[PDB]
Design a protein around this ligand. Structure first.
Ligand code: E6D
Length: 220
């Protein structure tokens, strides 16, 4: 497979968003993955509504600002027959009653694919599909203060993930330790966090922070 992938250069990726103080990481991960697959299909990049997911995908198992899962979001879009655009259903960082309106739907999916729990399988998916939804252990102060370089947290867990994010590619850069490979990850904490809102997370370092343990994408 390729040594370097960046789906932002192919037009698959919207700008970095900010979930605020709502526990809706799962919705931002899911919209990011669906934005990529919809672009793959139609050639149009349209920002999608996280609030739509927060308010409306409870029946699929999500819990609004109290948490959720990207697969449940993908199941909602399939079950519901649509998902509204960001512009039409903007983000409020709080859970309200469902206000979905199919007239303003701009996306659909026919299910989702869970990737085997191996970084090699994740690499194949990123290389051939587009941006991929992933879960990571972000529960460390080092992640809060990340600025640049390849993120490696020795206390990171590969089994207990708490934050859904989006892999938009992978690459390499020479480092002191010769652990040079990284996943290119879009976060949802605004562009002031990390490197314009992105983090390079250690790749092929024993599933660091669990990035390959719960990876998936929607079928479009
Ligand atoms: C993620 C978030 O906003 O983190 C703060 C930045 C949420 O807390 C969240 O939904 N977490 C989620 C696991 C992620 C998606 C890997 C979770 O804890 N889900 C629990 C089960 C769910 C069915 C309610």
């Amino acid at each position: 497979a390729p040594r370097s992938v960046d789906w932002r250069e192919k037009g698959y990726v919207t700008p970095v968003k900010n979930q605020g103080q709502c526990g809706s990481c799962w919705a931002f991960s899911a919209t990011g993955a669906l934005e990529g697959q919809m672009f793959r299909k139609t050639g149009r990049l349209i920002s999608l509504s996280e609030q739509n997911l927060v308010d409306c995908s409870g029946p699929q198992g999500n819990e609004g600002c109290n948490g959720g899962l990207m697969d449940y979001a993908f199941q909602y879009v399939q079950d519901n027959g649509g998902l509204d655009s960001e512009e039409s259903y903007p983000y409020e960082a709080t859970e309200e009653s469902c206000k979905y309106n199919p007239k303003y739907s701009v996306a659909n999916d026919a299910g989702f694919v869970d990737i085997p729990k191996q970084e090699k399988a994740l690499m194949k998916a990123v290389a051939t599909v587009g941006p991929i939804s992933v879960a990571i252990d972000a529960g460390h102060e080092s992640f809060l203060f990340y600025k640049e370089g390849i993120y490696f947290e020795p206390d990171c867990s590969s089994e207990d993930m708490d934050h859904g994010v989006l892999v938009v590619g992978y690459g390499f850069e020479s480092t002191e330790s010769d652990n040079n490979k990284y996943w290119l990850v879009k976060n949802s904490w605004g562009e002031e966090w990390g490197m314009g809102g992105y983090v390079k997370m250690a790749k092929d370092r024993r599933n660091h922070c669990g990035i390959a343990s719960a990876a998936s994408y929607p079928t479009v």
